[PDB]
């Protein structure tokens, strides 16, 4: 009955998307110089993981980082002097994501145990113990990010997202509307919005304060595995299993540029930006990472050296180094 | 060296003590056998957990004949199986358990789909996976007593028209066994370990121990390079 009305609304939305595309990002950005060949060298090589690295997250002071392995270990790395700061044992070894606090006090971890564990680092006792456990999801917890000390947004495999309250232990906002498993999560720099990518080949922009969706982006042909905002808080890049990256914009409400190459058939695990947003780093399944020019779609650099699939990819806050974590149990720091 | 300050030397010493504890835990994590417990709740799996013992993964730790088994039950997932099946690449063996007596029971959904054919397509989707090419599968055909009491009333031809034998127990059970064993496309590196449940103390555990013994022998032959 109202399916025809929904189809008419989709007609109006994509007609507006066609009407807003009066130009092309490839045509306007012809007046800029190319970046050339980016040559980056491994400065540090972190060793001591005996399992498959699935996630990392940089610290707010651009020196410490966290690492999540499948032997039940969260290791806090001092990236300058290769030291191990903390080795947190995990109650469940099946951990697919981890996060670090903007104040440096807490560490989140989650996975197939459907529980978001929040750990306190600055305890008076001297050891890192379990502070909170958020057991409110019925699907696998795929990503989690810290809005604040007392707030966390989690994305799970039950096609929903959640805004929590840490000191209480219950969720404050439930985000529903996805028809696929939400795989990746990225917060805005001003921490007012976020965007989530799911297995239904669509990325949805959510609202923290109101609690409902605002924009929905299509264009992908397969499952979306990675997402990351452009550092101004207005655009974001998505990575799929179609061996293509896509640059979506919130104000134009359409895609901008597709990042693809002909011999690459393998999916994207993790995307990230630099501090200026000129370089887009994306780790693939061909044992490598690639540094694309985010304004010219040129393959500006190749980061090789991992023996297995590069799972996680992080760029620090000041833009100095790039950490790459792979399934060969080595974290490699590039500069 | 002498370049480091008084606190950085103690930080390096703390890092070395942490790395020693990490390798001492990694040896114990590598000296244990992981078992991925697949199947469905309608087939009967918690009874096999209770026989072997005596909210997304149920971890069961048990020791038999000085071998530590960690069994991971993933039946509580309500999502797509593809996005988390790649985590179990380093598992030693799959234990897959389906019921015989559900040969004629229809599924809970409104569609007329047999539970036995849903189990065979699930076994075909799991067995023909790129992550589990060198992973052995231990098949448990459950509810033999109920299947024996039920096959005397209903024929096997209602399931699939291929069966042309008699309505006896042993021939039909062996034919269901070979129909499950025909789904293996990769017959070179993978072997299917089909075993009817005995429902007796130290029988299924003994079979799983012998299967894990054969897989550890194959892994040791790969580690030697003799294989």
């Amino acid at each position, epitope marked *: 009955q109202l399916r025809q009305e929904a189809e008419q609304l989709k007609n109006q939305i994509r007609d507006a998307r066609k009407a807003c595309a009066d130009a092309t990002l490839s045509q306007i950005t012809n007046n800029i110089d190319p970046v050339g060949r980016i040559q980056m060298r491994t400065r540090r090589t972190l060793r001591g993981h005996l399992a498959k690295i699935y996630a990392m997250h940089w610290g707010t002071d651009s020196r410490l980082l966290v690492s999540a392995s499948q032997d039940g270990k969260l290791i806090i790395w001092d990236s300058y002097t290769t030291n191990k700061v903390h080795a947190i044992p995990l109650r469940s070894s099946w951990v697919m994501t981890c996060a670090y606090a903007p104040s440096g006090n807490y560490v989140a971890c989650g996975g197939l145990d459907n529980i978001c564990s929040i750990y306190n680092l*600055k305890t008076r006792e*001297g050891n890192v113990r379990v502070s909170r456990e958020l057991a409110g999801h019925t699907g696998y917890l795929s990503c989690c990010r810290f809005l604040d000390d007392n707030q966390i947004v989690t994305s799970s495999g039950d096609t929903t997202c959640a805004l929590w309250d840490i000191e209480t232990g219950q969720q404050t906002t439930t985000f529903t509307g996805h028809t696929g498993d939400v795989m990746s999560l990225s917060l805005a720099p001003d921490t007012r919005l976020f965007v989530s990518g799911a297995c239904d080949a669509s990325a949805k922009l959510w609202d923290v304060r109101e609690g409902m969706c605002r924009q929905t982006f299509t264009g992908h042909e397969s499952d979306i595995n990675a997402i990351c905002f452009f550092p101004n808080g207005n655009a974001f890049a998505t990575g799929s299993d179609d061996a293509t990256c896509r640059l979506f914009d919130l104000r134009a409400d359409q895609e901008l540029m597709t990042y693809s190459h002909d011999n690459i058939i393998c999916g994207i695990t993790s995307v990230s930006f630099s501090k200026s947003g000129r370089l887009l780093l994306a780790g693939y399944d061909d044992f490598n990472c690639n540094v694309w020019d985010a304004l010219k779609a040129d393959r500006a650099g190749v980061l090789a050296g991992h023996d297995n699939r590069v799972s996680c990819l992080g760029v620090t806050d000041d833009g100095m180094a790039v950490a790459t974590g792979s399934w060969d149990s080595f974290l490699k720091i590039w500069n | 060296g002498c370049t480091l300050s008084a606190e950085d030397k103690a930080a390096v*010493e*703390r890092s070395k003590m942490i790395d020693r504890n990490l390798r001492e835990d990694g040896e114990k994590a590598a000296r244990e056998v992981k078992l991925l417990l697949l199947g469905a709740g309608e087939s009967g799996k918690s009874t096999i957990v209770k026989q072997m013992k005596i909210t997304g993964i149920v971890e069961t730790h048990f020791t038999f004949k000085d071998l530590h088994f960690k069994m991971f039950d993933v039946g509580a997932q309500r999502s797509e199986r593809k996005k988390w099946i790649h985590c179990f690449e380093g598992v030693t063996a799959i234990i897959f358990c389906v019921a015989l007596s559900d040969y004629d029971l229809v599924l809970a959904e409104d569609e007329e789909m047999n539970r036995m054919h849903e189990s065979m397509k699930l076994f075909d989707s799991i067995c023909n996976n790129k992550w589990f090419t060198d992973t052995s599968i231990i098949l448990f055909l459950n509810k033999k007593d109920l299947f024996e009491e039920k096959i005397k009333k209903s024929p096997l031809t209602i399931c699939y028209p291929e069966y042309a034998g008699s309505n006896t127990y042993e021939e039909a059970a062996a034919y269901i066994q070979c129909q499950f064993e025909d789904l293996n496309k990769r017959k070179d590196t993978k072997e299917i370990y089909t075993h009817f449940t005995c429902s007796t103390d130290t029988k299924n555990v003994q079979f799983v121990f012998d299967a894990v013994t054969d897989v550890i022998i194959k892994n040791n032959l790969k580690d030697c390079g003799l294989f």
Partner: single-chain antibody
Amino acid sequence: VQLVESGGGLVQPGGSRKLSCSASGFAFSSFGMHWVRQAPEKGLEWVAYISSGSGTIYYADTVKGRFTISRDDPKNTLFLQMTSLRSEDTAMYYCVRSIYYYGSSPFDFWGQGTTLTVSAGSADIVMTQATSSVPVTPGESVSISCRSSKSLLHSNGNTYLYWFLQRPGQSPQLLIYRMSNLASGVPDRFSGSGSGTAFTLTISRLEAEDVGVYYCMQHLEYPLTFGAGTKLEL
């Protein structure tokens, strides 16, 4: 979190005595332990230090050979075997915990203190304070300076100057670690600064609780030489 040490008392001159510190309320196995002595009329003085896991052991230059440090992690007990102690060793002994990583705050918690009463160095960085007694009033801003014999700035960027407040009749506590970071439980009244040679400690809107003796400390190299102590008075 508590460190209670015992074993002191009247000792015959030339004898021996073993001390024991019971640690409870924290992770004992991951902390390096210190011993600090204090003369009844002079300042504090470092004695020894054992690391986490009994790996690295440091002694002071005036107690080497006589004293012996040992720890027991299942019993959570730190021992101190003293042999052939002389007339100088009559002092008040403190037990200190310390953890060392990026962002750590060592010398944070201090023992209650035990007494010892017997019946009676050019390479070290000498710490010297410019004054010994400053008459203060509650409600003003008071600054106290210091002087070091060697530049405490290291090539990594840190500066190993720690500040301590010993109230009369109580144990000392940590105020400022690394000269730019406040310890936990310390108000925002205390503030520290330095130039790598001359250091300053400023106190805005001072209160009557802040009276006591201020000790500085260098941690650039072992042994740990302590300041003379600036006593405040009302």
